[PDB]
């Protein structure tokens, strides 16, 4: 099934988004329970990006699938980039931001389209592994163009994203 | 793409010193006289390899270790002393460290040892995959850089000498068979610590 | 007889090496998704190109942009792009300058994409010109227009893509080429209240024919001594 | 035509000295203690290979270079040193040239570099064709001499001894492979500089 | 190729703008090089008028294809009409502008289409005819519906408009 996470806002002032998977799955029902009851498993993600903005507004968001996303545990609502906690633009690694393009990502242009989609394999150094105290993805969402609409209505515009789990594997239940 | 002298084979598999041992022999006089140093195999000593390292994620490889061994007089009119002998003993993952100079960690019962004579050309030994997961981890998000490599120890077997000898050997390491997986970007800030800190 | 090359060590020698652990059960592989066999295969990624260097815009986010409607603009380049991946800094940081300094020499074309992010409603047309290597970079609307250039139109059409064709007498030349401009056509036109603050944002990517030799040490973070 | 002995293989295919490198070890004392010198290769410091050269235009070869070590002891009576050490690492061209003894240069990054032991037969090594033409010019009617070639550096890599010791590095360089084209008149006049002036 | 002659912007009290052929060309690079290198020349033309105007803008534009406008030689920018300099209802000889559409011409009208073609084939009494005296095409442009817009951006519509000669033929090289 598809899992929702909880709906971010998107304003002229963000620096950006970060989750973890799968983190933010842990209380997401019948897979947190899975991943809690089992100590050892494995299973992909497919992670869709909704974006509600309207013909009028301006502005790029750019989605980025980081295996291994150490930054120098939220949960569902993840956390916010730091303009000066990690930095958008160091990408949380000491990495200039131009160069965060080498992972898989999609870029969500306002003027093109609103939603995006992503396919991401399980990436680990063992065949299966702990679901609870390893992070095996990292969605990371940065906002490549400033925020920009009419001065006509409204200020933030919502975002929605969607994991569901694939090819689940689960064993050593406890 | 295309064309060689890019691969990862020929990117990664290049000859570079990563460590020096000082060793002593005898007669400390006013020093320590340390007989042994032990080195911690890693690529974080070295920032070229560190930052080929780190350019992506997952690697598989296998290490190549030369050790170039230079004696020298700390008195030049102490008198001709005897050609001098290294133990060069690599520990596995998981071995205990040698604290002292004759304790039962340099018997060599499990641990591979090459005994090196000064003028001889320099030793060489091949270190496989000694890892415990399917491959290194560069990078590792939760509760793996430590990724084993095991460790070497230098020491000198002569006797008893009056005369006082320095000598330094240099490690140089070379990796063979490189795979890698899950490309990351480069780094862009001074490292600061084993970790991905950065101010 | 003693002769360099013999009982010595050698940077490059590739000869077979005694085993320290013989008969070691080394681990299996397996199928790590994202496996590479040659560095070209992160040269022919996109990455941002740093553009606007500028005082404030430097070690930050607002230098990957540069706004497209001013309220005169200009007859002049908004930006401007040498053909030195290695040696110009808005192409040193990327992806492809960092690849190519760790090589002295390199070959083949070079990919450009520049991609706007406005309103749909925006309508306007911009010139993308080329300059030949060994030509100045033009300094106005028409002298983009005397050499090769293309029509951009800001519309349905939101991004452009140009090649740098592979121009040079000698097969490969240092990393120590041309220029690429960017200027107004017409106007940029927008509907009621409709921000006029949209902005640019520019990609380099290596082609299929890109080659590199005699492999050197990097610039970036050097202490040892 | 015809005959060997006469082609331009056997012609240009003889080895001759072409450098000389002295290096130091320590205790300066009164001395400046060069503990290394650099060379860029070229064939104008031998005037029988730069007349052979001179004879065409574009010629194409592969260098071998053998170096001799001979070591002397300043002072007869310092007393007996620990054998020498000494570290030859070739420049590629367009690499940075070594400034300082400890320096990032010596590291072998990326920079080939052979160790030689004193008493061992003498180092060799092969350089390939490292132009950026087609072929290597000896002349250059505009606005290419210096056809790189590289450089050579040696240095001690032992450690501090009282005793000095200084030694002297002779450099062989043997052309292989030699193709020529565009064959031009032999030269007349005594050479003044590295250019084609004469007086 | 194509050559595009400057742009020109369209205002709520513009009169008209009008060109002559191939004298605009006189100075575009290889086309005019050529005319200028050669006593004799022959070359059709290809007109495309574009109109950079969004979905809120009034107005209709009116291109029409002269064969020797001849007016009661500015170049690139050509000239404007005058509302009182040729007149615009007079057409710049004397004939209301409701006949004007005798000759071959398109009607760009900003709720249909902000786009039109003209195909221009070789019209003298002379097979052959001099490139530089000699005016064989006049294009006019004139604004059959006053320029509106809404109360919320803009005050000027670009114009852009590109010529690309064809079936050209050379003689007398000079």
């Given at each position: 099934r598809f899992y929702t996470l909880d709906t971010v806002t998107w304003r002229k002032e963000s620096r950006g988004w970060w989750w973890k998977l799968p983190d933010a799955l842990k209380d997401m029902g019948l897979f947190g329970q899975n991943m809690f009851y089992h100590y050892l498993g494995r299973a992909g993600y497919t992670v869709h990006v909704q974006c509600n903005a309207s013909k009028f507004h301006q502005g790029a968001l750019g989605v980025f699938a980081v295996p291994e996303m150490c930054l120098a545990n939220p949960g569902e609502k993840g956390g916010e980039f730091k303009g000066s906690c990690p930095v958008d633009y160091l990408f949380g690694s000491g990495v200039l931001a131009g160069n965060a393009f080498v992972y898989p990502h999609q870029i969500i242009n306002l003027r093109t389209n609103n939603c995006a989609t992503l396919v991401l394999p399980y990436v680990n150094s063992l065949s299966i592994d702990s679901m609870t105290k390893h992070n095996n993805?990292?969605?990371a969402i940065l906002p490549l163009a400033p925020l920009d609409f009419a001065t006509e209505s409204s200020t933030e515009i919502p975002i929605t994203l969607t994991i569901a789990p694939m090819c689940c594997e689960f064993n050593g239940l406890r | 793409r295309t064309r060689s002298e890019s691969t990862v084979e020929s990117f990664f598999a290049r000859g570079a010193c990563v460590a020096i041992i000082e060793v002593d022999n005898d007669a400390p006089?006013?020093?320590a006289s340390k007989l042994f140093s032990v080195w911690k195999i890693t690529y974080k000593d070295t920032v070229q390899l560190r930052r080929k390292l780190e350019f992506?994620?997952?690697?598989?490889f296998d290490m190549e270790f030369t050790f170039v061994v230079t004696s020298n007089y700390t008195d030049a009119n102490n008198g001709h002393a005897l050609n001098?002998?290294?133990?060069?003993?690599?520990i596995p993952p998981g071995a205990p460290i040698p604290g002292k100079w004759n304790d039962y960690t340099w018997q060599t019962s499990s641990n591979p040892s090459v005994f090196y004579t000064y003028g001889a050309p320099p030793a060489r030994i091949s270190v496989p995959y000694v890892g415990i997961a399917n491959a290194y981890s560069h990078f590792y998000d939760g509760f793996a850089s430590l990724n084993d490599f095991g460790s070497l120890a230098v020491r000198v077997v002569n006797d008893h000498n009056p005369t006082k000898l320095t000598?330094?050997?240099?490690v140089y390491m070379k990796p063979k068979h490189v795979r890698v997986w899950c490309p990351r970007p480069p780094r862009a800030v001074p490292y600061y610590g084993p970790g991905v800190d950065y101010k | 007889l003693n002769t360099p090359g013999s009982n010595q060590y050698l940077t490059a020698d590739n000869y077979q090496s005694p085993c320290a652990i013989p008969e070691f059960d080394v681990t299996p592989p397996i199928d790590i998704p994202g496996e590479v066999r040659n560095m070209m295969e992160l040269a022919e990624i996109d990455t941002m190109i740093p553009l606007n260097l500028t005082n404030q815009r430097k070690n930050t986010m607002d230098m990957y942009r540069v706004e497209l409607n001013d309220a005169a603009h200009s007859d002049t380049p908004i930006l401007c792009l040498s053909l030195s991946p290695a040696s110009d800094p808005r192409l040193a940081h990327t992806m492809l300058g960092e690849i190519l300094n760790y090589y002295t020499h390199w070959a083949g074309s070079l990919k450009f994409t520049f991609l706007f992010c406005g309103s749909m409603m925006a309508t306007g047309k911009l010139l993308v010109s080329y300059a030949p290597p060994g030509a100045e970079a033009p300094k106005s609307r028409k002298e983009a227009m005397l050499g090769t250039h293309v029509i951009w139109d800001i519309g349905l059409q939101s991004s452009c893509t140009m090649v740098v064709p592979?121009?040079?007498?000698?097969?490969?030349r240092q990393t120590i080429g041309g220029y690429i401009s960017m200027f107004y056509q017409t106007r940029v036109v927008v509907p009621l209240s409709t921000p006029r603050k949209m902005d640019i944002l520019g990609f380099v990517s290596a082609c299929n024919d890109f080659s590199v030799r005699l492999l050197r040490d990097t610039t970036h973070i050097s202490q040892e001594a």
């Amino acid at each position: 099934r598809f899992y929702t996470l909880d709906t971010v806002t998107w304003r002229k002032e963000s620096r950006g988004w970060w989750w973890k998977l799968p983190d933010a799955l842990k209380d997401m029902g019948l897979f947190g329970q899975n991943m809690f009851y089992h100590y050892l498993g494995r299973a992909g993600y497919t992670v869709h990006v909704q974006c509600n903005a309207s013909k009028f507004h301006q502005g790029a968001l750019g989605v980025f699938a980081v295996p291994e996303m150490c930054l120098a545990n939220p949960g569902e609502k993840g956390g916010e980039f730091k303009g000066s906690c990690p930095v958008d633009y160091l990408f949380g690694s000491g990495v200039l931001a131009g160069n965060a393009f080498v992972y898989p990502h999609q870029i969500i242009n306002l003027r093109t389209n609103n939603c995006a989609t992503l396919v991401l394999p399980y990436v680990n150094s063992l065949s299966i592994d702990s679901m609870t105290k390893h992070n095996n993805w990292g969605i990371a969402i940065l906002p490549l163009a400033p925020l920009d609409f009419a001065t006509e209505s409204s200020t933030e515009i919502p975002i929605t994203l969607t994991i569901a789990p694939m090819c689940c594997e689960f064993n050593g239940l406890r | 793409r295309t064309r060689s002298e890019s691969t990862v084979e020929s990117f990664f598999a290049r000859g570079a010193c990563v460590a020096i041992i000082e060793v002593d022999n005898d007669a400390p006089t006013k020093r320590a006289s340390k007989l042994f140093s032990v080195w911690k195999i890693t690529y974080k000593d070295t920032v070229q390899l560190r930052r080929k390292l780190e350019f992506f994620t997952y690697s598989r490889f296998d290490m190549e270790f030369t050790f170039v061994v230079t004696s020298n007089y700390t008195d030049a009119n102490n008198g001709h002393a005897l050609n001098q002998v290294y133990q060069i003993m690599y520990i596995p993952p998981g071995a205990p460290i040698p604290g002292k100079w004759n304790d039962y960690t340099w018997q060599t019962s499990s641990n591979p040892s090459v005994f090196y004579t000064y003028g001889a050309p320099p030793a060489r030994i091949s270190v496989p995959y000694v890892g415990i997961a399917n491959a290194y981890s560069h990078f590792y998000d939760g509760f793996a850089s430590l990724n084993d490599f095991g460790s070497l120890a230098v020491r000198v077997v002569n006797d008893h000498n009056p005369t006082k000898l320095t000598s330094k050997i240099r490690v140089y390491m070379k990796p063979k068979h490189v795979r890698v997986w899950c490309p990351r970007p480069p780094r862009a800030v001074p490292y600061y610590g084993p970790g991905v800190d950065y101010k | 007889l003693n002769t360099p090359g013999s009982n010595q060590y050698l940077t490059a020698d590739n000869y077979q090496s005694p085993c320290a652990i013989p008969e070691f059960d080394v681990t299996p592989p397996i199928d790590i998704p994202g496996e590479v066999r040659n560095m070209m295969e992160l040269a022919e990624i996109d990455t941002m190109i740093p553009l606007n260097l500028t005082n404030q815009r430097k070690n930050t986010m607002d230098m990957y942009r540069v706004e497209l409607n001013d309220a005169a603009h200009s007859d002049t380049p908004i930006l401007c792009l040498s053909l030195s991946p290695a040696s110009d800094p808005r192409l040193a940081h990327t992806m492809l300058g960092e690849i190519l300094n760790y090589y002295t020499h390199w070959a083949g074309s070079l990919k450009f994409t520049f991609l706007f992010c406005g309103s749909m409603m925006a309508t306007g047309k911009l010139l993308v010109s080329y300059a030949p290597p060994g030509a100045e970079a033009p300094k106005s609307r028409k002298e983009a227009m005397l050499g090769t250039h293309v029509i951009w139109d800001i519309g349905l059409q939101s991004s452009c893509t140009m090649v740098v064709p592979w121009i040079s007498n000698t097969t490969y030349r240092q990393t120590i080429g041309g220029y690429i401009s960017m200027f107004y056509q017409t106007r940029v036109v927008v509907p009621l209240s409709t921000p006029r603050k949209m902005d640019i944002l520019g990609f380099v990517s290596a082609c299929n024919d890109f080659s590199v030799r005699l492999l050197r040490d990097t610039t970036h973070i050097s202490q040892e001594a």
